[PDB]
């Protein structure tokens, strides 16, 4: 009868929507895409800014 019963993210009944997205994410870039909504701030944190991002 198995040994571990590896649950999945959606089995965690009091996890939040952003919380489940973060738990599923594999890389730091993916996490930043979830967490940072302001596109100019995200661009700064990614070290990749256009002239429009810089002005903003």
């Amino acid at each position: 009868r198995s040994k571990e019963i590896s649950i999945e993210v959606e089995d965690i009944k009091d996890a939040g929507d952003t919380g489940k997205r973060l738990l599923k994410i594999n890389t730091p870039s993916g996490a930043r895409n979830i967490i940072i909504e302001n596109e100019d701030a995200k661009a700064l944190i990614n070290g990749e800014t256009t002239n429009t991002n810089k002005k903003n």
Binding site: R1, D11, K13
Partner: protein, 56 residues
């Protein structure tokens, strides 16, 4: 004597396939929250009747 299925007095009305957990007085009652699940019923039973279901 490792039993694959038990006969437990229903603490309520139980439908076929319902996941069961402990209830008042140690009776078997329907649940929905994995952790409390110890077995799944294989037959319908009314409160006070035995219900037979596989462990797992």
């Amino acid at each position: 004597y490792p039993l694959a299925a038990w006969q437990v007095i229903a603490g309520s009305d139980i439908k076929v396939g319902d996941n069961l957990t402990t209830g008042k007085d140690g009776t078997a009652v329907p649940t929905d929250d994995p952790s409390t699940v110890f077995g799944y019923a294989v037959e319908e039973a009314q409160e006070g009747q035995l219900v037979t279901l596989v462990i797992s």
